[PDB]
Amino acid sequence: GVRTSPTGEKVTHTGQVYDDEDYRRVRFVGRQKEVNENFAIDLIAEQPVSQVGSRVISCDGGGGALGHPRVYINLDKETKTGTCGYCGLQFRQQH
Amino acid sequence: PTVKPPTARKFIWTNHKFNLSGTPQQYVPYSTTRKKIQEWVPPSTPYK
Amino acid sequence: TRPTVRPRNDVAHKQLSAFGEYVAEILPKYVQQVQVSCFSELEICIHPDGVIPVLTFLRDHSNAQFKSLADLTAVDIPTRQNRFEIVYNLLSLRFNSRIRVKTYTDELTPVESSVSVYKAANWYEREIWDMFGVFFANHPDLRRILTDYGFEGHPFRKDFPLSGYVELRYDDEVKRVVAEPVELAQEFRKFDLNSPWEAFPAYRQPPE
Amino acid sequence: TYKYVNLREPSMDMKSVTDRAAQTLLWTELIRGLGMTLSYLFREPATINYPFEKGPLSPRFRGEHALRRYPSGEERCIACKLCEAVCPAQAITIEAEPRADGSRRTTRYDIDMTKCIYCGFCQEACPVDAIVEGPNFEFSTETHEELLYNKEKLLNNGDKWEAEIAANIQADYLYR
Amino acid sequence: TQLITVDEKLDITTLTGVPEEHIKTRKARIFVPARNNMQSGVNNTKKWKMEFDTRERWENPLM
Amino acid sequence: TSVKPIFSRDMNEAKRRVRELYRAWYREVPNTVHLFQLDISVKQGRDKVREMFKKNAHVTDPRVVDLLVIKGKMELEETINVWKQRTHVMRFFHETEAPRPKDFLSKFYVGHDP
Amino acid sequence: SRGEYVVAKLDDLINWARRSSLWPMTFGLACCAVEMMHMAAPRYDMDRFGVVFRASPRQSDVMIVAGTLTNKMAPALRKVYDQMPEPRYVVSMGSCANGGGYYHYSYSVVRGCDRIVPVDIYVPGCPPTAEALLYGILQLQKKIKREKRLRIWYRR
Amino acid sequence: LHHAVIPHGKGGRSSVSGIVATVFGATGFLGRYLVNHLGRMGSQVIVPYRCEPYDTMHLRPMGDLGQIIFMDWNGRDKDSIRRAVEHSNVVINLVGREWETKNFDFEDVFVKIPQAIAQVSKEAGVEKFIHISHLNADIKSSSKYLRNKAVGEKEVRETFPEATIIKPADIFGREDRFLNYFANIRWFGGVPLISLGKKTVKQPVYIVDVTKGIINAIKDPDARGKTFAFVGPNRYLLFDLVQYVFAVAHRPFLPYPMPHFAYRWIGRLFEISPFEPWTTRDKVERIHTTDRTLPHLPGLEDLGVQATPLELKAIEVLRRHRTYRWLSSEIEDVQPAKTV
Ligand SMILES: CCCCCCCCCCCCCCCCCC(=O)OC[C@H](COP(=O)(O)OCCN)OC(=O)CCCCCCCCCCCCCCCCC
Ligand SMILES: NC(=O)C1=CN([C@@H]2O[C@H](COP(=O)(O)OP(=O)(O)OC[C@H]3O[C@@H](n4cnc5c(N)ncnc54)[C@H](OP(=O)(O)O)[C@@H]3O)[C@@H](O)[C@H]2O)C=CC1
Ligand code: SF4
Numbered sequence A: 001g002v003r004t005s006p007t008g009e010k011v012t013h014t015g016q017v018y019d020d021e022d023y024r025r026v027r028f029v030g031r032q033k034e035v036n037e038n039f040a041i042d043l044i045a046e047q048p049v050s051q052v053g054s055r056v057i058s059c060d061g062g063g064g065a066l067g068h069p070r071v072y073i074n075l076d077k078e079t080k081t082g083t084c085g086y087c088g089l090q091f092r093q094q095h
Numbered sequence B: 001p002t003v004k005p006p007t008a009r010k011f012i013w014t015n016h017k018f019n020l021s022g023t024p025q026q027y028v029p030y031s032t033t034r035k036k037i038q039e040w041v042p043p044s045t046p047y048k
Numbered sequence C: 001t002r003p004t005v006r007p008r009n010d011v012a013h014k015q016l017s018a019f020g021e022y023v024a025e026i027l028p029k030y031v032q033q034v035q036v037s038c039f040s041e042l043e044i045c046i047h048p049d050g051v052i053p054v055l056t057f058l059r060d061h062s063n064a065q066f067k068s069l070a071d072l073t074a075v076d077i078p079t080r081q082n083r084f085e086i087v088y089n090l091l092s093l094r095f096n097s098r099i100r101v102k103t104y105t106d107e108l109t110p111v112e113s114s115v116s117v118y119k120a121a122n123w124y125e126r127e128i129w130d131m132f133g134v135f136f137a138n139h140p141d142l143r144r145i146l147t148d149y150g151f152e153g154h155p156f157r158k159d160f161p162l163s164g165y166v167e168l169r170y171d172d173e174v175k176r177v178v179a180e181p182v183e184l185a186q187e188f189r190k191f192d193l194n195s196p197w198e199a200f201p202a203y204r205q206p207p208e
Numbered sequence D: 001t002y003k004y005v006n007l008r009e010p011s012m013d014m015k016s017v018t019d020r021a022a023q024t025l026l027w028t029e030l031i032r033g034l035g036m037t038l039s040y041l042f043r044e045p046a047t048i049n050y051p052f053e054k055g056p057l058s059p060r061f062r063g064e065h066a067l068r069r070y071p072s073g074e075e076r077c078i079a080c081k082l083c084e085a086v087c088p089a090q091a092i093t094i095e096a097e098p099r100a101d102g103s104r105r106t107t108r109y110d111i112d113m114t115k116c117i118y119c120g121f122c123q124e125a126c127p128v129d130a131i132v133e134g135p136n137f138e139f140s141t142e143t144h145e146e147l148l149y150n151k152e153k154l155l156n157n158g159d160k161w162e163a164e165i166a167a168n169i170q171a172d173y174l175y176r
Numbered sequence E: 001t002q003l004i005t006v007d008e009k010l011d012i013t014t015l016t017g018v019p020e021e022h023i024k025t026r027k028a029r030i031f032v033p034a035r036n037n038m039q040s041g042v043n044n045t046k047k048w049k050m051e052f053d054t055r056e057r058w059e060n061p062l063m
Numbered sequence F: 001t002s003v004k005p006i007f008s009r010d011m012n013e014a015k016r017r018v019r020e021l022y023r024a025w026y027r028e029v030p031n032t033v034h035l036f037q038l039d040i041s042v043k044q045g046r047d048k049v050r051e052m053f054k055k056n057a058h059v060t061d062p063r064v065v066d067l068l069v070i071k072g073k074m075e076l077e078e079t080i081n082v083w084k085q086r087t088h089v090m091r092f093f094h095e096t097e098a099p100r101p102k103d104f105l106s107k108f109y110v111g112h113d114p
Numbered sequence G: 001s002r003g004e005y006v007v008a009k010l011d012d013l014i015n016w017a018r019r020s021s022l023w024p025m026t027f028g029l030a031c032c033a034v035e036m037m038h039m040a041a042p043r044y045d046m047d048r049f050g051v052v053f054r055a056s057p058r059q060s061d062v063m064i065v066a067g068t069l070t071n072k073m074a075p076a077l078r079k080v081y082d083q084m085p086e087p088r089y090v091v092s093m094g095s096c097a098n099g100g101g102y103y104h105y106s107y108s109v110v111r112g113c114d115r116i117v118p119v120d121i122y123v124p125g126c127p128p129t130a131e132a133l134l135y136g137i138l139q140l141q142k143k144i145k146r147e148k149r150l151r152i153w154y155r156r
Numbered sequence H: 001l002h003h004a005v006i007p008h009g010k011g012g013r014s015s016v017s018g019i020v021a022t023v024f025g026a027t028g029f030l031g032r033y034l035v036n037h038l039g040r041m042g043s044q045v046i047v048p049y050r051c052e053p054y055d056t057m058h059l060r061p062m063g064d065l066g067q068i069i070f071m072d073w074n075g076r077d078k079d080s081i082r083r084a085v086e087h088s089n090v091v092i093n094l095v096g097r098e099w100e101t102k103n104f105d106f107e108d109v110f111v112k113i114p115q116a117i118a119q120v121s122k123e124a125g126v127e128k129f130i131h132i133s134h135l136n137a138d139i140k141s142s143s144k145y146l147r148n149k150a151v152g153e154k155e156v157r158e159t160f161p162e163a164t165i166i167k168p169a170d171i172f173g174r175e176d177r178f179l180n181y182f183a184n185i186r187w188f189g190g191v192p193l194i195s196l197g198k199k200t201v202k203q204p205v206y207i208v209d210v211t212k213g214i215i216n217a218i219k220d221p222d223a224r225g226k227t228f229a230f231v232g233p234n235r236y237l238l239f240d241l242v243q244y245v246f247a248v249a250h251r252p253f254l255p256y257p258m259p260h261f262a263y264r265w266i267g268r269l270f271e272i273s274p275f276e277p278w279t280t281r282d283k284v285e286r287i288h289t290t291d292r293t294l295p296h297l298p299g300l301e302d303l304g305v306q307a308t309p310l311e312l313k314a315i316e317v318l319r320r321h322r323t324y325r326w327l328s329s330e331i332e333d334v335q336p337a338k339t340v
């Protein structure tokens, strides 16, 4: 989900884009601006919320030692889903 | 990889690119941060 | 304390303390302090005026025979009025031992060169003149050995910054390598890494 | 506990003296050296045919740097700044801010490849296996500024070499 | 006696190799550093420090 | 206040050594002009020598001026033999550095430095 | 036109002769010179590609800056590059010869050899391996191959 | 004023100067000196090159990283010019040829190309345009060089009212074609001149003075719209100038009379070479043309640049042409020429 600036330049996931009057675009004429089209926010927004039947849950990111440090997430609030600090996966108590 | 293929993911490139240095498709470095200080734009109306 | 703690050598500690007492009582004119570290190393802090009469003793006495000069070093500690600390490391092949001799001087007072004791120091203290500014009196050839030919200042002093005051670049107008004031593209980021909690209670200085 | 190298005393008898004189007048050991070169002429040379025949490597090889991802699309780095604090040549510059969904993510991640010494301190100090040292080493450029990698280049390198980086980590993760 | 009498003040300004611009325009500060209030340890406030005034730091055009 | 002298017991011997060093430099300048093939005149080199000597003219300490004489003799020895290059000799003439602003107004115009 | 084809074929011939007969100079400073000698080892065998070391700058084609270019060394390197006959190419290898490497903030280190001499190919690493240096040499050969000297001379 | 154009630093190599300069024809002599002076201040220089990129390689150590952007351009293509000048705030024109090639004549280099560059710079919003012409440019001159240079100067002034036109007299330097040409006449014979060259008066100017004048004119807000004339401090005759050149180079000087009509006859013989010619008829005409005096045009002194005399840099220029016997002689071992 990369939007295009009115100058034709692409906008990164950070939101960086050179202005119309910015001279530094001379570094891009005759060449290309390297941006990544796989945005992490849009890809993590497509992950479904996992329903679990426990008050607290443990997340390690998957793979065991190949993931992030294991953390514990509380799911007492029913209005919002508890999200992992590292992986961004969200869990919900099904009650 | 014919007998032991790697695990496929959504973000992995399906088209490999060789060394692009010296080509028009070469990498150009740039800052990836927004502007820090926001200047005060003057009003577009005279004081009269 | 068996598998992790480094084993302690007490026989070498006792022998080095006895030899330190021996050296201190042989030369009471120049020897100021004698200490033995916890890992069994002997330090003889002496007066600068006895740089020569001590070293030759350790070179020529039948009970010392420190025939090898391993390293000649200088330490810059700006908190003292005599900021420079010249350290000699001696190796005795006959008795299979090592000793350390320390002395102090400031920027202006010269100290006597030991080229008549060990000739390796002919280069070594010359290196000190290149990087600390300690002038060694009575030297055959004292000049710069490591820095640039037109370099000014002593780089290993603590008040000297990391990057120098000049840098070299090629200029095509004068067809020459020219020196210009330094302008770092990215500054060396100074990190504050000192822990605010006391670590070793055994080295706790008494308060004022 | 020591041996007397080069202290053997030569002989004196007439046969050995005649042998030494014959070796002097007829150059026997020069013929021995010629024979050793002639023996080395008839061996298989150890030359590989680059670039069709790459030299052997190891899965622990340190080359170009890359940024990994979790197996859902999310980038692994959470901007903890351990790699830039452990980098000995200060090649890593990190700037971070909370993004739209409140996740601790980077905004600037720059590695200066001309400053980097390729020692793998960042790939071993990373708590979430985000930054890795990939196995690529054929990435020489024609310009100096092309060796100044920003976050986008590192993410593209990670997406390019994930299929190899994951296998190398799966091979070598039990030794760490 | 091999000793002389020197009564003038010390001056190593001409031997340190520093240019005069970074001698006559600098203003050093000698202070005991302030304790970090986020922590509670007091070991960083033991020794006096000499620091210099902060000069201009700008942004690189490239990176 | 009793210190250890380096070479001069008082100011007279030190300024005599300064005088001898200046004589040696003044004699040496035409040879370094000739050998290094510099594009400058002998008078320019001699006035540069005079400027470098008058830069340290405020020193009233025998040990400091003794060290200055030692460093000057070291530089003279380094330039008698060709150990310095043309760049090292010509670095006394800042031919590539633009003159900085001098008065208050131009320094106010060009930056924040005092 | 036939003249354009003639100058194109002549440019191809001279580029082939210049790129298949590279003569570097025996010039190392540090660790990266040890890796360069390992590129000269029997395994990688630079002399297969016509790459043979020459001691004198007057009979050399390229110069490989392998090591740390310090402040005391830069005039010597500049004079050595100046003495080489045209056409001359410089391959910068190692982090020290690229941007200062470990010693970027040192007082007596030139931050890259680009400040002294023009550079064609930058080879990154510490040290960049003999395989990587051979790859850089082949990349330099490819850069020489696509030169357009006589074509531009005909156009000018 | 955008925040990326505000100057910063101490004016060093890594500082920001806020000058975005497009130097057309920067792969030459004056272009090389101008790029060197701009790059040491920390400026973004866009260099459009027509020749081989290898010849641009010497322009690489001339500034910091990312400061010099090389790009292809064509003199008859306005699209490449608009690609090059679309972000710069100062455009400098150094395009010139001492001879006429098969593809380009003097009108294609001095008339059409500067007019196209100035028009594209005007339509792209560039606030500063600087053009380089010749001091002796006039319509009625015998040489086609000065005629076309005057025509191009008039067209540039017409299409760009704020253009700063700079007219050097005759620039000498290490890579010039003025003193080196005189030192290289000695191969052919005994350096012939028109009536011994005792009637033409010339005042050559150092290259660094012209470069500093251009830099100051870029930095001067009051230099827009003017027509400067860059001249040397002393006016010499041609005979004494050649005499001083051969005295510095330590070569024998044996001049001889030779008529004006026969000089062009052999001058056109050297121009039939397909490579760069040694001399042409136009070079003979411009060498034997006396430098006009225009006191109304402001000079190097009004831009704060002191004119360096020829006696200070002539030895530096001409030490390459000496033999081994007199290679080590100093600067002061020569007699300076008499000025008028
Ligand atoms: C009107 C028509 C005529 C017009 C005038 C032109 C006349 C002919 C001029 C010479 C030939 C021009 C063409 C030159 C080659 C062009 C094609 C080319 O570059 O081929 C590349 C190929 C090698 O490819 P490479 O990139 O090295 O592959 C990697 C290997 N894994 O290269 C090869 O496979 C080898 C190429 C060999 C080229 C020919 C042999 C050399 C020249 C011999 C004749 C001249 C010299 C005679 C002797 C002089 C004294 C020694
Ligand atoms: N004698 C002197 O030095 C004097 C010179 N001048 C003027 O000053 C200017 C600068 O002189 P200078 O640099 O030394 O001259 P040069 O001939 O040495 O260099 C000309 C430059 O412009 C380029 N160029 C020339 N013709 C064309 C063209 N038709 N199309 C595209 N690019 C072209 C050249 O590139 P490439 O390498 O591709 O040819 C080169 O970069 C010129 O206009 C000259 O007339 C004025 C007074 C005195
Ligand atoms: S490999 Fe080492 S030098 Fe390179 S970025 Fe990582 S920590 Fe820094």
Ligand code: SF4
Residues within 6 Å of the ligand: D076, D077, D078, D079, D080, D081, D082, D083, D084, D094, D122, D125, D126, D127, D128, D129, D130, D131
């Ligand atoms: S160590 Fe890993 S998680 Fe921490 S800032 Fe570096 S790349 Fe990100």
Ligand code: SF4
Residues within 6 Å of the ligand: G030, G031, G032, G066, G067, G068, G093, G094, G095, G096, G097, G101, G102, G125, G126, G127, G128
């Ligand atoms: S880049 Fe690394 S391997 Fe090469 S010379 Fe420098 S420290 Fe040695």
Ligand SMILES: [Zn+2]
Residues within 6 Å of the ligand: A059, A060, A061, A068, A084, A085, A086, A087, A088, A089
């Ligand atoms: Zn998780």
